[PDB]
């Protein structure tokens, strides 16, 4: 209480405490924004995150249908044992047939060769037959001349 006591020390000091206030209010704005945007990002990332939830969804159906379908149409390629087994069943039935028929064809060829001979031996014995019965007539003829000549002797013939 003597002329001057704590003059501006109180006056120019509230400005201190007042200016610090000037900041915490500014900065609180800066952080206020960053927050608005960082939570802004999460809006966009959170979205994309399901856009992928979807894309990845589809693929679980497609790689499934296509992997079990490779089995669905693979049982049909398992019939390659019934289809190639016939290469044993059929190559034999056709293989043995081309052999047992080509052969039975030589028979008919060997047989008709003999039917050809029997047709000839029975051809000649048809000739030697007529031919021999011929030598008989000449003899049958001469036979008579003799019966006569002898008949005359038993009587006539001076």
């Amino acid at each position: 209480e003597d002329k001057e006591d704590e003059v501006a020390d109180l006056k120019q000091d509230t400005e201190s405490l007042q200016k610090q206030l000037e900041e915490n209010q500014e900065e609180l704005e800066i952080v206020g924004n960053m927050l608005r945007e960082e939570q802004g990002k999460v809006d966009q990332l959170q979205k994309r995150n399901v856009a992928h939830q979807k894309e990845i969804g589809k693929l679980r159906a497609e790689l499934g249908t296509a992997q079990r379908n490779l089995e669905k149409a693979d049982q049909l390629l398992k019939r390659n044992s019934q289809q190639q087994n016939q290469q044993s069943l059929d190559m034999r039935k056709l293989g043995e047939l081309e052999a047992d028929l080509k052969e039975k064809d030589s028979m008919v060829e060997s047989l008709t060769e003999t039917i050809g001979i029997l047709r000839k031996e029975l051809e000649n014995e048809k000739l030697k037959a007529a031919e021999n019965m011929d030598s008989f007539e000449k003899l049958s003829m001469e036979n008579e001349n003799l019966k006569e000549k002898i008949a005359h002797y038993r009587a006539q013939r001076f």
Copy 2:
């Protein structure tokens, strides 16, 4: 009476102020945390997204091949099928052969018919020519016999 009630007034001006810088730092305390907590949420979502996106590329290839396979094994169903074209022609045209067997079958049975007959007719032409050989010998034996009777008669000239 005023120098005493002066610094008393600046107090209030500082009471109200010190409160603000305090109550305010509480807003800045929280709001600062809210921000970081979001940046936490962001950075990470930024990850699962790169996780999915990368792993969406894997399923993309697993689907790719798994499809080429469904087709690579399907060309093979076009070949397994066309062998049904040649296997059918083999099961139907092989039958013509087992059928062309009965043609030669009836032939070798039909020829042994004509071979059996000629062999039997050859036997009769032989039985016949066996008589003629006999009735001829009788004859020859008769003339030979007569010439002799005759030659005895000729014994009347001497």
